[PDB]
Design a protein around this ligand. Structure first.
Ligand SMILES: [K+]
Ligand SMILES: [K+]
Ligand SMILES: [K+]
Ligand SMILES: [K+]
Ligand SMILES: [K+]
Ligand SMILES: [K+]
Ligand SMILES: [K+]
Ligand SMILES: [K+]
Ligand SMILES: [Mg+2]
Ligand SMILES: [Mg+2]
Ligand SMILES: [Mg+2]
Ligand SMILES: [Mg+2]
Ligand SMILES: [Mg+2]
Ligand SMILES: [Mg+2]
Ligand SMILES: [Mg+2]
Ligand SMILES: [Mg+2]
Ligand SMILES: [Mg+2]
Ligand SMILES: [Mg+2]
Ligand SMILES: [Mg+2]
Ligand SMILES: [Mg+2]
Ligand SMILES: [Mg+2]
Ligand SMILES: [Mg+2]
Ligand SMILES: [Mg+2]
Ligand SMILES: [Mg+2]
Ligand SMILES: [Zn+2]
Lengths: 205, 203, 121
RNA sequence: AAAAUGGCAA
RNA sequence: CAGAAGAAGCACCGGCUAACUCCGUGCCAGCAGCCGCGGUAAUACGGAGGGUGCAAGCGUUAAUCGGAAUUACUGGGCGUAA
RNA sequence: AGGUUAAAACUCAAAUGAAUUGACGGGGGCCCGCACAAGCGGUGGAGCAUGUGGUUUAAUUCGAUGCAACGCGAAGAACCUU
RNA sequence: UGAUUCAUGACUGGGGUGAAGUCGUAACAAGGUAACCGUAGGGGAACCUGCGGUUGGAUCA
């Protein structure tokens, strides 16, 4: 129910950094990011339209660490929700407690954030939530447990978060180690690299 | 001394035994059963010049109405002892048999196949040729090679006169359809004359 | 066709007959091998394909392909059959389920083991 | 005037 | 409370269709949904390395609708294709 | 005599229409070539030379096989060459 | 005593599939007698012939 394999292979297949490492060091130093994984990775085969659509969907999944069944359910929800399906889908992935914890800087990676959430180190609105998929509403307060505040990982993650660009829709206070989900991120707030239209088209295939 | 029988003769014994077993299985009339039983005994007596106690014992089992396949197998194995194996020529001799073929490669033949082999036939798939070696009535070794069709079709085989998987065979102008597998063909063959007729037809 | 014509005689759908009638809309059926033999395929293929004549529990008698390399099936073997015709074997509409009932799994198979009833090494 | 026939292959 | 400890498999990789090579085999053994593949340099068989897709499942079979505007009401045709 | 109404099993992965480029025609047209016609000398018969097939042999080394193999590779096999 | 449906039956009809079988060469070119349609008669077989019909026939220098 989670991918436990090598992380950099995923980024190499996608051809872009998926932030599956802390970012303490450059991905290029850690691996040959440009080259696809395996023996025939150096060869670059032509990609079909289906191939392009598949790769975009896999990229988004690999970024947020969501398996196909859950990702399909997100798509279905996004299509049901009023407005732009592709934008709705990205908003749902952003609303995940796992992602929010990473974006608040409590976790160095989304996987690290996942372990924190899973290991009951995270509270939402003062109640402990250990579900990675939990959806955070606007004006919700996400905070580390007092017991877990002392953890070294969390402090290191906060420092890394300072290096990264700060999310506008999240207000986070260090030391207090609490954050507020002010609003659902706009499409503009998220990276323009992702092409959500390919995913929507793929699910209409 | 145990009677010595040719492989084709043994195959004929097998056929008559199978017939008698089938008669026991599928015939509800005693009179018909008895006639076949007597005939089967006569055939074996004709096949073997001398009947030893072992042959008699086998006959007795065959004579019994309650014949069994496992019993038949044992009887056949005893009869297999009587069978005389095909004499494989020396590789040099075989090269002499097919002098025109250069550096001809002879496939290793298993002995049990050689025991039941009235003739030895092998196919060179690269050349699409079938090679047949046999001893004539004079008992001189004779070898023939002919083109064998890659296509395998259902038809009666000239050598064994049984419906089988066959291919058109043209010696070195109509070809003759023969079993693609000579080993299976040899098992099917019950009369050496049929093979000899095939050789005569090829001319 | 005019609306008036359709009112008199509505559009008619096709029969859509099954290609696996002996199964009778069951995923598999058990049968007893009456005969196990080899048959040559239709052109342009050449092989000795392994097949069995099977008498099913429903009483239908059909030919079923024995897939994989090597088998232990004999007359009186109890096998399970599934749908699946063999293109180059006319009249063979079913496959034997390897590793079910009397039929054994294929020996020394390392890939597609589940398709040949082979337990993980 | 007569004037038939020619395996399937790739 | 103790300790990474007790917890990953299945199908697929010729085209359709995401994913390629080596070795074995040599119209055989075998594969196969369709088109087809196999007769000595097989990305199509069998194994291996690598990869792709799914994942406590994964494949296969059966069965329904879809794609099929291929019974066409929405929404098809009828000189020569029925 | 038959007409009319009118199936199924089974089987194939096509069948089909129009048009395109060729090829072909005991279709047409127009040209041409020792194609025919008009001629001259031959081959096929004989003996012999030479090559080939076949047969024979311990071996008669290998290759060339409608035209476009057969005094051909060989502008020269006693040994050598082989 | 009927009807209907299913199974089965010596033998028999036509159909399909399968070897490079046997006999021809009917069609496709004017396919060497243009082909084909209906019908009738004939003939080992493809077919042939009559009568009417069609062009979905080639040729015309
Ligand atoms: K083939
Ligand atoms: K309509
Ligand atoms: K049909
Ligand atoms: K002369
Ligand atoms: K001369
Ligand atoms: K009846
Ligand atoms: K005619
Ligand atoms: K007529
Ligand atoms: Mg699950
Ligand atoms: Mg691909
Ligand atoms: Mg190979
Ligand atoms: Mg289905
Ligand atoms: Mg419809
Ligand atoms: Mg239509
Ligand atoms: Mg027509
Ligand atoms: Mg029409
Ligand atoms: Mg009637
Ligand atoms: Mg002369
Ligand atoms: Mg040559
Ligand atoms: Mg010399
Ligand atoms: Mg004709
Ligand atoms: Mg004619
Ligand atoms: Mg005509
Ligand atoms: Mg006539
Ligand atoms: Zn034979």
């Amino acid at each position: 129910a989670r991918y436990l394999g090598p992380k950099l292979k995923l980024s190499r297949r996608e051809g872009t950094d998926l932030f599956l490492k802390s970012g303490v060091r450059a991905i290029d130093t850690k691996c040959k990011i440009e080259q696809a994984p395996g023996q025939h990775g150096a060869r670059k085969p032509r990609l079909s339209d289906y191939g392009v659509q598949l790769r975009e969907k896999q990229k988004v999944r690999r970024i947020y660490g969501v398996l196909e069944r859950q990702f399909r359910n997100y798509y279905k929800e996004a299509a049901r929700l009023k407005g732009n399906t592709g934008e709705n889908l990205l908003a749902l992935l952003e609303g995940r407690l796992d992602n929010v914890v990473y974006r608040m800087g409590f976790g160095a990676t989304r996987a690290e954030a996942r372990q924190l959430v899973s290991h009951k180190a995270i509270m939402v609105n003062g109640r402990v939530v250990n579900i990675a998929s939990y959806q955070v509403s606007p004006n919700d307060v996400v905070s580390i447990r007092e017991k877990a505040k002392k953890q070294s990982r969390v402090k290191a993650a906060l420092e890394l978060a300072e290096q990264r660009e700060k999310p506008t829709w999240l207000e986070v206070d260090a030391g207090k180690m609490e954050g507020t989900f002010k609003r659902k991120p706009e499409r503009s707030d998220l990276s323009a690299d992702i092409n959500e239209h390919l995913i929507v088209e793929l699910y209409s295939k | 001394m145990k009677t010595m029988i040719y492989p084709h003769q043994y195959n004929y014994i097998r056929s008559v035994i199978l017939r008698l077993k089938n008669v026991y299985k599928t015939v509800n009339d005693k009179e018909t059963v008895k006639v076949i039983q007597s005939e089967t005994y006569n055939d074996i007596n004709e096949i073997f010049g001398h009947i030893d106690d072992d042959i008699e014992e086998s006959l007795k089992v065959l004579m019994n109405i309650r014949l069994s396949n496992k019993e038949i197998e044992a009887i056949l194995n005893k009869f297999l002892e009587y069978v005389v194996p095909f004499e494989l020529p020396s590789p040099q001799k075989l090269q002499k048999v097919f002098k025109k073929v250069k550096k001809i490669k002879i496939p290793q033949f298993e002995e049990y196949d050689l025991k039941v082999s009235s003739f030895v036939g092998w196919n060179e798939l690269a050349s699409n040729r079938k090679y047949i070696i046999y001893y004539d009535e004079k008992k001189q070794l004779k070898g023939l090679y002919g083109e064998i069709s890659n296509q395998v079709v259902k038809g009666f085989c000239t050598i064994c006169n049984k419906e089988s998987n066959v291919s058109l065979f043209m010696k070195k102008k109509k070809g003759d359809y023969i079993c693609r597998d000579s080993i299976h063909c040899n098992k099917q063959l019950t009369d050496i004359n049929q093979f000899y007729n095939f050789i005569d037809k090829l001319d | 066709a005019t609306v008036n014509q359709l009112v008199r005689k509505p559009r008619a759908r096709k029969v859509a007959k099954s290609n696996v009638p002996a199964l009778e809309a069951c995923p598999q059926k058990r049968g007893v091998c009456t005969r196990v033999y080899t048959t040559t395929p239709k052109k342009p293929n050449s092989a000795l394909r392994k097949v069995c004549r099977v008498r099913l529990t429903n009483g239908f008698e059909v030919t079923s392909y024995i897939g994989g390399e090597g088998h232990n099936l004999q007359e009186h073997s109890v096998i399970l059959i599934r749908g699946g015709r063999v293109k180059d074997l006319p009249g063979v509409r079913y496959h034997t389920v390897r590793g079910a009932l009397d039929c054994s799994g294929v020996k020394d198979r390392k890939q597609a083991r589940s398709k040949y009833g082979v337990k993980r090494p």
